[PDB]
């Protein structure tokens, strides 16, 4: 395969082929297996450092429809029995139980409320060692899980890495989502980035009736862009051989909105998972850091103010002002929002966040970003500022990992697809960033009329990235597609080398 020492590469356009279908309720693999109190959804996340990590899980069924009742969550304990062998649970750690609610003050649509949720911290563990866990609460007859194991990230230095690192966007719960997922866990990942776009509940109406486009279908005749909550407990339900024992970094993405009652938003995916809030000392679900060996990650939110005068980033010039590269040589950012595909669907988006944040980051010698968002994959050569530029990042864009909505397949540069540029900002975050290029092949138009030299490799399939960190100066990318199935098919690869006396 390539390597970015070689300088950019030609673009690559692979042909079109010539919509994925939702998981039913009646998926054995989306139902409630347990009964009472016992623990379902099961899901491990890191801390800010490999010494600490989070466990979290449902106690409960959820209510969804009539006159739901919140559960009281000071009712059932937040228990995490671990140790270093699955015969002597001996350490012991607690934590918090809360609920949620998804409520619609509108007649006719019906209200949800869920299990209770925990989520409890492990300390002092011993970076790349496997532990042995139960959670529940030991003092409610039969809520206790089984016993379950994960391996925490190794200790955090310049030769020190995870072996392999999965990186999935805008997963969704469809019968593709499981051959992403199927593929995902056969490669054996120790740690799964899930770049936003989880579930896709706002893809149906509070009484269960989905489609692949709510614009499309139910933008104009309902009173609010509704969601099946369900649709939540069925993906963690799915999820939970992979999440059990593998660490999960999310990230939240457009269709985590989902506004309810008060114009609260974000409801489901700030209760849901854990993130390291406290430790990377954002305090907020939607941005946060963590070490992974020597790997500094960085997680943005694409959908919370990331203006230069913004909380967002006041905390990001603080955590990358306390990076040693020494000790953590690789730099990676997720957000979901790409700021370089070159797709028609989201063109451009999220331009206010690259003008935001772009300079920022080229500054400190961002290694590599990976987004979802966009329905296809690509891959970016180096670039800054819309410039080919030997230290720009490598963008990345893995939102196919399966959903129901349409794949991406034209592109803005395709002839006659260029899209009117006041039609592309993001509608949520306000703002129009997204001026006619001034310089180089495209000058004076909004896009080009052949794939942009920026982007070294575009394929509309679904699919999972696996990201391989050799050395504090040599990663392996690759990225697999789904339709293929045979033994160690991939679909982009390439080294990705960084040069840190040339660009720091
Ligand atoms: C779902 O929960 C909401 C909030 O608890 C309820 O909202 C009410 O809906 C009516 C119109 O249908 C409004 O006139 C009320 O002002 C709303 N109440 C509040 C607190 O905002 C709603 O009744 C619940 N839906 C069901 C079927 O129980
Ligand atoms: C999503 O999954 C479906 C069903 O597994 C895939 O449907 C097949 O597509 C291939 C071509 O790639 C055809 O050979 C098959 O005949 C299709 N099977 C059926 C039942 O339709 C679908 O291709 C997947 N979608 C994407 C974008 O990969
Ligand atoms: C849900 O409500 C919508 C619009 O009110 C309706 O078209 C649809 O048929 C309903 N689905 C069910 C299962 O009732
Ligand atoms: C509603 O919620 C969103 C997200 O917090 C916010 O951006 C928006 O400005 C709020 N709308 C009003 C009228 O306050
Ligand atoms: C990016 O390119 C535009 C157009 O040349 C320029 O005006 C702008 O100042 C550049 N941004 C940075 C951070 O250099
Ligand atoms: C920008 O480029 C588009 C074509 O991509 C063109 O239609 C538009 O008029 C241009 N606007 C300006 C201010 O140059
Ligand atoms: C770093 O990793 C690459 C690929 O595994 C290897 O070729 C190289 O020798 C390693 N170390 C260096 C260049 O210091
Ligand atoms: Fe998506
Ligand atoms: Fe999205």
């Keep these: 395969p390539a390597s970015t020492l070689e300088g950019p590469s030609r673009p690559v356009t692979v042909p079109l082929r010539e919509h994925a279908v939702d998981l039913p309720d009646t998926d054995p693999r989306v139902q409630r297996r347990v009964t009472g109190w016992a623990p379902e959804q099961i899901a491990v ?15 409960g069924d959820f209510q969804m429809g009539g006159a739901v009742k919140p559960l009281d969550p000071g009712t059932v304990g937040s ?18 139980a809360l609920v949620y609610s998804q ?33 529940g609460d030991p003092s409610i007859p039969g809520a206790m899980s089984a016993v379950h194991a994960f391996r925490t990230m190794p200790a955090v230095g310049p030769r020190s890495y995870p072996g392999r690192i999965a990186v999935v966007g805008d997963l969704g719960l469809t019968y593709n989502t499981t051959s992403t997922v199927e593929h995902m866990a056969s490669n ?5 980035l899930l770049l936003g776009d989880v579930s896709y509940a706002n893809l149906y109406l509070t009484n269960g009736t989905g489609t692949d486009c709510y614009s ?19 993906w963690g ?40 809030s406290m430790e990377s000392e954002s305090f907020s679900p939607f941005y946060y850091s963590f070490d992974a060996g020597g790997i500094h990650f960085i997680m943005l939110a694409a959908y919370a103010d990331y203006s230069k005068s913004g909380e967002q980033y006041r905390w990001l010039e603080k955590d990358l002002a306390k990076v040693d590269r020494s000790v953590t040589p690789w730099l990676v950012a997720g957000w979901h929002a790409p700021w370089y595909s070159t797709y028609k669907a989201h063109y451009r988006e999220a331009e206010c966040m690259r003008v935001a944040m772009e300079e920022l980051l080229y500054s400190y010698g961002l290694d590599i970003v990976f987004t979802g968002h966009v329905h296809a994959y690509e891959r970016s050569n180096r670039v800054f500022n819309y410039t080919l530029d030997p230290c720009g990042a490598v963008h990345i864009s893995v939102g196919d990992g399966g959903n129901r909505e349409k794949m991406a397949t034209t592109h803005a540069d395709d002839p006659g697809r260029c899209p009117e540029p006041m039609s592309t900002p ?26 942009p030299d920026y982007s070294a490799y575009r394929e509309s399939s679904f699919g999972h990235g696996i990201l391989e960190v ?22 982009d690869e390439i080294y990705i080398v960084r040069e840190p006396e040339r660009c720091l």
């Design 188 to 192: 054996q990942p120790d740690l799964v």
């Design 79 to 96: 228990v995490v029995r671990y140790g270093l062998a699955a015969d002597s649970l001996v350490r012991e750690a607690t934590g918090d």
């Design 237 to 276: 339900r799915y999820m939970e051989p992979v999440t059990s024992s593998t660490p999960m970094m999310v990230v939240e993405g457009n269709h985590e909105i989902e506004q309810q009652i008060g114009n609260k938003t974000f409801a489901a995916y700030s209760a849901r998972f854990a993130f390291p």
């Design 103 to 135: 409520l619609y003050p509108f007649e006719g649509l019906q209200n949800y409320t869920s299990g209770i949720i925990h989520h409890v911290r492990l300390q002092g563990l011993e970076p790349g060692t496997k532990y042995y866990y139960q959670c």
């Design 470 to 491: 050799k050395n504090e100066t040599h990663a392996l990318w690759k990225w697999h597609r789904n339709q293929d199935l045979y033994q160690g098919a991939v679909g």
């Design 426 to 451: 993001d509608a949520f975050m306000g703002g129009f960033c997204a001026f006619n290029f001034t310089s180089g092949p495209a000058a004076g138009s909004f896009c080009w009329d052949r794939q």
């Design 216 to 234: 499309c279908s139910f933008a104009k005749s309902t009173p609010i862009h509704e969601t099946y909550q369900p649709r939540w407990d069925y």
């Design 45 to 59: 996340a890191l801390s800010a450092a490999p010494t600490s990590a989070w466990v979290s899980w449902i106690t």
